[PDB]
């Protein structure tokens, strides 16, 4: 054993061990002797920063120490329901947005590929018998959950036909949930999504217009009883959920 070799070995050991301590952002105390099991609780249980993105377009700031995102879940926008004229036929509810989730996706430190969430389908309630708007698509890291299609305008005594829900495109996610398709109209319920549930139409003569419960849901379409003119519920925009381990604040 060389006089310098063992010194180099112990220096390497002491530089290896502590790098974890500030790896998760802790002081190199020489008395505690545990240090959160060497920052291990903080690096596995703690530091699990979760970010919810709802802006229509923006750049996610990835911290320097982050190299892999895990459990990126996204949901496309939802489509509004169709309007109902002053007749008897029901309106077709808009289809809910699709969604996907991925795991262990790799991201370089620095700025992120810009997320874009899908805006909710606005109600085309400016006139009777108008098909509602279609919700926008949600795209991130080359994977897109397309927004659900809108409802369908309905004339007298002719109920509309069902509309397609969302889909998934781009790099294939490990798991994808196609969005609930909007219904033909007699049931009229709007389609659900990953984070939402199929909402039903509300029978009223004032156009109460119950929207979809949560993100990605589709409007339940309009209805007409006793001269009612309910335009149909509005959809809900999609969100992006990401999780990563980092000592920095989210």
């Amino acid at each position: 054993l060389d006089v310098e070799l063992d010194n180099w070995l112990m220096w390497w050991l002491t530089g290896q061990v502590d790098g974890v301590i500030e790896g998760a952002g802790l002081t190199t105390d020489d008395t505690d002797l545990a240090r959160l099991y060497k920052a291990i609780q903080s690096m596995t249980s703690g530091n699990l920063r979760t970010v919810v993105l709802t802006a229509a377009s923006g750049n996610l700031p990835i911290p320097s120490d982050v190299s892999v995102l895990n459990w990126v879940r996204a949901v496309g926008g939802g489509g509004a329901g169709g309007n109902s004229n002053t007749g008897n036929s029901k309106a077709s509810g808009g289809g809910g947005g699709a969604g996907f989730d991925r795991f262990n996706v790799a991201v370089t430190p620095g700025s992120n590929v810009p997320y874009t969430v899908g805006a909710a389908g606005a109600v085309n309630g400016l006139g009777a018998g108008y098909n509602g708007g279609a919700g926008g698509s949600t795209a991130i890291l080359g994977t897109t959950a397309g927004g659900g299609a809108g409802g369908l305008g309905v004339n007298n005594n002719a109920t509309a036909v069902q509309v397609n829900g969302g889909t998934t495109s781009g790099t294939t996610p490990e798991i994808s949930y196609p969005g609930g398709l909007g219904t033909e109209g007699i049931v009229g319920t709007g389609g659900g999504s990953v984070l939402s549930q199929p909402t039903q139409r509300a029978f009223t003569n004032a156009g109460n217009n119950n929207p979809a419960n949560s993100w990605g849901g589709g409007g339940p379409g309009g209805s007409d009883f006793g001269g009612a003119w309910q335009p149909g519920g509005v959809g809900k925009q999609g969100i992006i959920i990401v999780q990563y381990f980092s000592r920095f604040a989210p």
């Binding site: 229509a56 708007g133 698509s137 080359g142 495109s169």
Partner: protein, 162 residues
């Protein structure tokens, strides 16, 4: 720095529009094939794609058959609304049994009911004719109370009694 206005064209139809900063890479964000193309800010959802041009949405087709169907259906359930199905059955039984006997032997109330049914059918036929002769006017004023004229007091009397 300016924001591009992209639109996702499917089968010559715009189904979704977005406004994104120009520095983005559409391929690196939406995957290999996306269908997003640059469009002028005037482009809205539900627009034609004819050549290198975003044509506006074509106007809805005007169907005379749809007009007639709506006119008839609007006046279809109205007969069952003003007079219920059970009330219709009551009136029909009354008139049938009253006609089953000789007019001389008919009771005064039977004759009154027969007359009331006479003006009732006259009003119904007038309403039907006016509704049918409305496609050329497309249900515009004179409409409503003019499409459906006020029934006589006999009509409301028979509606109330049966």
């Amino acid at each position: 720095m300016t924001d591009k206005h992209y639109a996702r064209v499917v089968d010559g139809l715009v189904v979704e529009t977005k406004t994104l900063p120009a520095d983005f890479n559409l391929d690196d964000l939406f995957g290999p094939d996306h269908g997003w193309v640059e469009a002028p800010l005037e482009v809205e959802q539900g627009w034609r794609k004819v050549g290198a041009k975003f044509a506006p949405a074509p106007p809805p087709e005007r169907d005379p058959a749809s007009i007639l169907a709506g006119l008839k259906a609007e006046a279809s359930r109205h007969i069952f609304a003003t007079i219920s199905a059970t009330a219709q059955s009551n009136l029909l039984l009354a008139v049938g049994l009253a006609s089953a006997k000789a007019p001389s032997a008919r009771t005064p109330e039977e004759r009154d009911l027969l007359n009331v049914a006479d003006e009732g059918r006259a009003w119904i036929d007038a309403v039907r004719a006016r509704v049918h002769a409305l496609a050329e006017h497309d249900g515009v004023t004179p409409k409503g109370e003019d499409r459906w004229p006020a029934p006589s007091e006999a009509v409301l009397e028979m509606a109330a009694k049966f």
